Design a protein around this ligand. Sequence first.
Ligand SMILES: CNC(=O)CN1Cc2ccc(Cl)cc2[C@@]2(CCN(c3cncc4ccccc34)C2=O)C1
Ligand SMILES: CNC(=O)CN1Cc2ccc(Cl)cc2[C@@]2(CCN(c3cncc4ccccc34)C2=O)C1
Ligand SMILES: [Cl-]
Lengths: 305, 296
Amino acid sequence: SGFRKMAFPSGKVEGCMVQVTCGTTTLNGLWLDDVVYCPRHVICTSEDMLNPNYEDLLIRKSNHNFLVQAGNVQLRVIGHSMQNCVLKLKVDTANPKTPKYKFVRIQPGQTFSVLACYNGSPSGVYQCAMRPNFTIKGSFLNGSCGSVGFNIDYDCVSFCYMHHMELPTGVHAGTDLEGNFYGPFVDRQTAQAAGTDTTITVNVLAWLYAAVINGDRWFLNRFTTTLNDFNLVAMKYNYEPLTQDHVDILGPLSAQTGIAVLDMCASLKELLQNGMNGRTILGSALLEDEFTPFDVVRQCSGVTF
Amino acid sequence: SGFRKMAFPSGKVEGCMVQVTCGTTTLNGLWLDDVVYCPRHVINYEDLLIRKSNHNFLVQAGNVQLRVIGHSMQNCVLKLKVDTANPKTPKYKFVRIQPGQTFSVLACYNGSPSGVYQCAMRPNFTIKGSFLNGSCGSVGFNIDYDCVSFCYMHHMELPTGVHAGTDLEGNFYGPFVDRQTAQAAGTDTTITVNVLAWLYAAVINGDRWFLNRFTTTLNDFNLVAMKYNYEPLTQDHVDILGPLSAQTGIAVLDMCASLKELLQNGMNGRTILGSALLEDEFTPFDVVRQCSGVTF
Ligand SMILES: CNC(=O)CN1Cc2ccc(Cl)cc2[C@@]2(CCN(c3cncc4ccccc34)C2=O)C1
Ligand SMILES: CNC(=O)CN1Cc2ccc(Cl)cc2[C@@]2(CCN(c3cncc4ccccc34)C2=O)C1
Ligand SMILES: [Cl-]
């Protein structure tokens, strides 16, 4: 019993964190095999950030301009290249602690664990989701750039995020491990803001099924809804449109609890209209959207209470 | 910016988790040096233990079987002497925590870690964790510099869905026993010093809507707090909140008057750090560490 925001064990990722220093800038890098991946803005000064020409800044660099530190040992850089917004530093030593890994690009609504680091040293681990506006509500301070987001499936670490910047509203933006940003953001100090955020409907529904699995049914009603009528109401509360794909993905949870997806949708409609009236669902006074249908199946029991 | 419930990096603890099987029971063990620590319920425990031999205990570390060469009991924990010392043993201490203090839990099943989360020892000595059958022997810990302080070992789930366990010396937190009997968690209270710390964290992150021009005496605050099932705030708590009071410029009794108004009038459609409830599972030190960048 119980339902907590759970992160993956971070050990396999801790063994990859290194410190990258280029001139006056110091941030984090991910050491996998003989390559260290880090944000390309490590070659930038604060002035350069306004309109940086990365290609022109990088051509002026040699290998020995980059200092890589793994624990107390200095790694020697023997090559360097740029791939989108990520800098790839070829080092002389392969990481003996390299896990089985993949680089995956996630979609909004997907969750992942973040290992927050400063000076190549991990300080904390937390779970979060890629928001519909492509930002993450993280906890990052100056020096956390290069911190990574990941999932662990069996013994394989799937790297999905590298931290690059903080937006004016306090949210965070970054890239996949191939250097492609999530969202319409640039690694430039431009007037850029996160788009209006929305609630991840499929995730809220999954968490309502998790509450039913843990023995909470007070929010259920005798009503059903069409998918179209649900979306007209949901849009009014800044909820993401629920697609047929989302309904298909919610199938196993509907079968396990015996509550059809469109009947759970009718409960959500009523929850939005009424609020909770002094009640909580899984110890929360708000509707939680950072647990996917796959997270609920992973954490919750196969037997409903 | 941002404020999340953050756990310590679990790597140093992952390298210690093993699977312990004794007959029909399979739970988790903590392998430190040549000893494996696990709940004694894996087996009148003195009479049950005398009937067991070393080879009855099956210990698995990854894909390798560890050979048990000795066994002893210390309170509610079983200590299995094994043939191999753990090469991944970190610098460690066994510490007993007090209610209100927080820690990270590495939840395991079959000696394999599956997740990490942060939680607090409730005033009623239970933890609101996320544990399924097979999670017994999962451990709670803090990291300070390079030393892992083990503070909790999971034993059981109570009828309300909350969890109970021991320190690493086998002494239970709370009035619980390790057996099938009628036991329930006592009435719980809110950890006031922790709620105050989290209000200071909201001010640090730019949220001041809840502040007012008022102050309160410590006694008047406690009379109000006692009515909302809040733990009494002591002078020690006020002293511990000193650094956060100095950093934000808001006196502890000034922040207490903001909490008093939130308790009597609610939030009124407003949230604090994305929460519609007053959060009590961040200590004053957790707030300072998350808003400073302390690494391990
Ligand atoms: C908040 N931004 C700034 O003050 C200036 N920043 C412009 C800027 C523009 C583009 C890019 Cl790709 C990087 C950056 C910086 C690099 C570091 N960084 C940060 C990252 N994470 C969390 C932070 C928390 C506090 C302060 C800075 C943080 C940035 O946003 C710097
Ligand atoms: C809920 N408990 C029971 O039904 C009976 N339980 C008696 C019992 C008596 C003494 C002791 Cl020291 C342990 C125990 C059990 C052993 C495992 N365990 C559990 C622990 N965590 C999470 C669980 C989730 C679901 C079911 C069991 C869980 C217990 O409390 C089992
Ligand atoms: Cl995805």
